[PDB]
Amino acid sequence: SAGESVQITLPKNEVQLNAYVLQEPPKGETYTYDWQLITHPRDYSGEMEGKHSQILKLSKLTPGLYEFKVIVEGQNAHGEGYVNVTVK
């Protein structure tokens, strides 16, 4: 698996995250991505839009560490990536 870490600051917070998997399949075969927020600041109320898509949209991000875990699977091919976001 991977471990791509991103960072942001200032008042702006709403951000979107895509998903990149190795061994890309044919057009006829699309995967069903799945995002799981495993760690977030204690204040974070926020929401998650388009989890099952390639891009998860985040809004209302309070300062702290955010831990995600996108899981990409298909026909005889399970997988997943990891991503950390740090807000100041």
Binding site: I38, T39, H40, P41, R42, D43, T62, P63, G64, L65, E67, N84, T86, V87
Partner: peptide, 19 residues
Amino acid sequence: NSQPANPGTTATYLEGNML
């Protein structure tokens, strides 16, 4: 921590995540 964590995590938590 404000929540339970997975075993052996090496993440760098910030004040926003702590109690």
